Design an enzyme around this catalytic site. Structure first.
Site, short mmCIF file in Angstrom:
data_model
loop_
_atom_site.label_atom_id
_atom_site.label_comp_id
_atom_site.label_asym_id
_atom_site.label_seq_id
_atom_site.Cartn_x
_atom_site.Cartn_y
_atom_site.Cartn_z
N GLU A 105 0.82 -1.21 0.00
CA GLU A 105 0.00 0.00 0.00
C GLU A 105 0.86 1.27 0.00
O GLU A 105 0.57 2.21 -0.74
CB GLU A 105 -0.92 0.05 1.23
N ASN B 183 -7.59 8.39 -5.61
CA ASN B 183 -8.39 7.27 -6.07
C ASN B 183 -9.25 7.76 -7.24
O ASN B 183 -9.43 8.96 -7.41
CB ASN B 183 -9.29 6.76 -4.93
N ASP C 149 -12.40 7.79 -7.67
CA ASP C 149 -13.61 8.50 -7.30
C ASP C 149 -13.37 9.89 -6.73
O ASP C 149 -14.31 10.57 -6.30
CB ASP C 149 -14.43 7.67 -6.32
N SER D 134 -11.47 10.53 -4.08
CA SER D 134 -11.01 10.46 -2.69
C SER D 134 -9.50 10.27 -2.71
O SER D 134 -8.91 10.15 -3.78
CB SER D 134 -11.66 9.28 -1.97
N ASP E 54 -6.06 8.30 -0.46
CA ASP E 54 -5.62 7.36 0.58
C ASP E 54 -4.40 7.96 1.28
O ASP E 54 -3.52 8.52 0.63
CB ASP E 54 -5.17 6.02 -0.02
N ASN F 249 -8.55 5.47 3.21
CA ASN F 249 -9.37 6.26 2.28
C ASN F 249 -10.19 7.39 2.93
O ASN F 249 -10.87 7.17 3.92
CB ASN F 249 -10.28 5.28 1.53
N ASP G 276 -15.12 -3.68 9.69
CA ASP G 276 -16.31 -3.30 8.89
C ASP G 276 -17.16 -4.44 8.32
O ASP G 276 -18.29 -4.21 7.90
CB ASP G 276 -15.90 -2.34 7.75
HO LIG Z 1 -6.15 3.51 -3.41
HO LIG Z 2 -19.11 -0.62 5.46
#
Ligand SMILES: [Ho+3]
Ligand SMILES: [Ho+3]
Ligand SMILES: [Cl-]
Ligand SMILES: [Cl-]
Ligand SMILES: [Cl-]
Ligand SMILES: [Cl-]
Ligand SMILES: [Cl-]
Ligand SMILES: [Ho+3]
Length: 129
Positions: free
Chosen positions: A35, A46, A48, A50, A52, A59, A101
């Site tokens: 990562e 990213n 979209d 966003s 990281d 994110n 999550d």
């Molecule tokens: Ho990413």
């Molecule tokens: Ho979730």
């Protein structure tokens, strides 16, 4: 800060990530390698819109606030910038929420694609833990 392999394993263990949610330390070290290449200052946009942040590329779409991710959330209740510090405490505390999550470590696409099912124990070889 760019952590050494064993230096990061030690930090993660101290912060209670080893075996958290059933994921052995090597799984976490492996995820961090792909990562961020162990660099706490790593940031990546990213598709979209966003971004990281940090050693575990948390994110801004859901976990931290960076003030430029429309409709996003801040579930870890911290500025994304705090995930770039040399002290990984904030990143670990937030990662603990992410991995809880529901989909475990699959939340990290890199972990699913490059660590999952491999000999992750190799990531902590030679380390004094
Ligand atoms: Ho990413
Ligand atoms: Ho979730
Ligand atoms: Cl390495
Ligand atoms: Cl392991
Ligand atoms: Cl935002
Ligand atoms: Cl630390
Ligand atoms: Cl799981
Ligand atoms: Ho020991």
């Amino acid at each position: 800060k760019v952590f050494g392999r064993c230096e990061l394993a030690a930090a993660m263990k101290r912060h209670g990530l080893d075996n958290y949610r059933g994921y052995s330390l090597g799984n976490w070290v492996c995820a961090a390698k792909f990562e961020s290449n162990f660099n706490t200052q790593a940031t990546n946009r990213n598709t979209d819109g966003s971004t990281d942040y940090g050693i575990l590329q948390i994110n801004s779409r859901w976990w931290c606030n960076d003030g430029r991710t429309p409709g996003s959330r801040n579930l870890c209740n911290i500025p994304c910038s705090a995930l770039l510090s040399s002290d990984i405490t904030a990143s670990v505390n937030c990662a603990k929420k992410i991995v809880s999550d529901g989909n475990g470590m699959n939340a990290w696409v890199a972990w699913r694609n490059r660590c999952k099912g491999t000999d992750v124990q190799a990531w902590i070889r030679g380390c004094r833990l």
